[PDB]
Amino acid sequence: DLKDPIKISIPRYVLCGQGKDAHFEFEVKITVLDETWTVFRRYSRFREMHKTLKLKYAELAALEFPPKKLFGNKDERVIAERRSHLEKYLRDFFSVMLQSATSPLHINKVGLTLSKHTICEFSPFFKKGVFDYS
């Protein structure tokens, strides 16, 4: 309960945009303790998060971010595998950030408060934009 405070899943993906602005976005469902919310994020956004946070926190050097091949990303099977790898990435991301003692989210940091608020402050990837919902 308090030892597993952040849960995360990507139950589905959705095709957004029309023409060949058309791209997949992943439905990220996140629960921190009591609070649950959902954001839609394209692969680009996950990668930008990883890059940004990997230089701020060293414990994230051990994390391997899933690559994207140049061709073949219109195949739904590729996208489905991506959903899985991105969900595993997010789950490893939180494992590291909660268990690394050097981390601002270390479960045992004194006075650590954990909420949607502190998570959204920690990374704006998780901040709700226009299609996102609680």
d(CA 134, CA 129): 11
d(CA 134, CA 132): 7
The structural domains of the chain, with segments of one domain joined by +, span 1-134
Residue 117 φ then ψ, to 5°: -55, -50
Residue that is written with structure tokens 């934009």 in the block: 129
In 20-129, where do the E strands start and end? Answer: 23-32, 35-42
d(CA 121, CA 10): 21
Residue 14 φ then ψ, to 5°: -140, 145
Three-state DSSP class for residue 29: strand
Query: What architecture (CATH level 2) is domain 1-134?
Result: 2-Layer Sandwich (3.30)
Experimental method: X-ray
d(CA 26, CA 59): 25
Given in angstroms, what resolution was this structure solved at? 2.2
